[PDB]
């Protein structure tokens, strides 16, 4: 199983109107080619940063994508992942926990 294992989370415990960083982390996949996009209401977010290609002890790859954001209530934040082992794009939704 070399599909991307994906998690979505924020740098800080989130609050409405407070500046934060949205993270999408994919790991344990192969081949290393992968598409990872942070989305706000289905629209790609600006200022996204991509970690240089890295891998673990078991040769499986990983990648972090993060962007500064200010979480708005009534807005939906997610992470779109595309990979060869995936038949269709997988969307992982951020739980704001507030």
């Amino acid at each position: 199983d070399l599909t991307p294992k994906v998690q979505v989370y924020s740098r800080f415990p989130a609050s409405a109107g407070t500046k934060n960083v949205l993270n999408c982390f994919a790991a344990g996949f192969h081949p290393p080619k992968i598409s990872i996009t942070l989305m706000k209401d289905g629209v790609p977010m600006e200022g996204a940063q991509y970690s240089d290609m890295s891998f673990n002890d078991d040769w499986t790859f990983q990648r972090l994508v993060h962007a500064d954001f200010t979480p708005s209530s009534g807005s939906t934040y997610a992470c779109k992942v595309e990979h060869e082992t995936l038949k269709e794009p997988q969307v992982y939704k951020w739980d704001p926990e507030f």
Binding site: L2, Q7, Y9, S10, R11, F12, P13, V21, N23, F25, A27, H30, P31, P32, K33, Q49, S51, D52, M53, S54, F55, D57, W59, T60, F61, L64, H66, E84, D95, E97
Partner: protein, 271 residues
């Protein structure tokens, strides 16, 4: 005991792909990214403030040449390997990792291994001064390397060069490497389909190792719990979340317990 590690990993891809560098090398000191090279910039660049502040231009210069040297070597290696496997095209990867660990100042291990398409190909056994061929296709490589005394060359690097520089890096970044930052913890409950899923998130802790456990009425409960493992933030700190399934309205009986080097006693948190 004081443990320190130096680890370099190197990736060569035929299919990076779109707008991505096909060759990438990075280095880690005690698990922390501190240098980077790729086929786009064709130069080594700092990834931490402590290496940026302490290294001179001769260092970056010196590293860039080896980096450019490695890029060309793996460019050929990609070609050499697909022809060995009688492959004509497609998506392929070459992966190297090497480095050393020191304990109380002295080296305790040194490693040098590579993989083709995500599987073991060859690995240096510094003990028997031998390269282990993981697959039959690697036997020609094993032979020529030992033939040209590659074991002596890598024994020298792993036991002298790697150790010497790791000791330097540790001194350069002692203050940052040895720091401790508290996690910010939030417990959040969500009820759906007759199940109360309690989640516990620890935000922004350093160093990486941490244990987050669920307690019910004061007893450690690792039954219906699931962990996302330890995942990175963008700023060199880390994150983890653990969930547990409970009955509706029974949230008060559960505590999240966090064990981390920044905390004198385990932290206890509730919904």
């Amino acid at each position: 005991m004081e443990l320190h590690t130096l680890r370099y990993i190197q990736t060569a891809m035929t299919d990076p792909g779109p707008g991505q560098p096909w060759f990438v090398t990075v280095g880690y000191v005690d698990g922390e990214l501190f240098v980077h090279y790729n086929s786009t910039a064709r130069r080594y660049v700092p990834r931490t403030e402590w290496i940026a502040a302490k290294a001179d231009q001769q260092y970056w210069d010196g590293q860039t040449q080896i980096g450019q040297g490695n890029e060309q070597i793996d460019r050929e290696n990609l070609g050499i390997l697909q022809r060995r496997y009688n492959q004509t095209g497609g998506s392929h990867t070459v992966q190297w990792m090497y480095g050393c660990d020191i304990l109380e100042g002295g080296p305790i291990r040194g490693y040098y291994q590579m993989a083709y398409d995500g599987r073991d190909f060859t690995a240096f056994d510094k003990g028997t001064m031998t390269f282990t061929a993981a697959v039959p296709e690697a036997v020609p490589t094993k032979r020529k390397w030992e033939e040209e005394s590659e074991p002596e060359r890598w024994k020298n690097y792993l036991e002298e060069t790697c150790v010497e520089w790791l000791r330097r890096y540790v001194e350069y970044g002692k203050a940052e490497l040895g720091r401790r930052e508290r996690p910010e913890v939030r417990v959040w409950g969500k009820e759906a389909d007759g199940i109360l899923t309690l989640s516990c998130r620890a935000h922004g802790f350093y160093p990486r190792p941490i244990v987050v456990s669920w307690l019910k009425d004061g007893a450690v409960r690792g039954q219906d719990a699931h962990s996302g493992g330890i995942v990175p933030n963008g700023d060199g700190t880390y994150h983890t979340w653990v969930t547990i399934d409970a009955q509706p309205g029974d949230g008060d009986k559960y505590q999240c317990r966090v064990e981390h080097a920044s905390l004198p006693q385990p932290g206890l948190y509730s919904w």
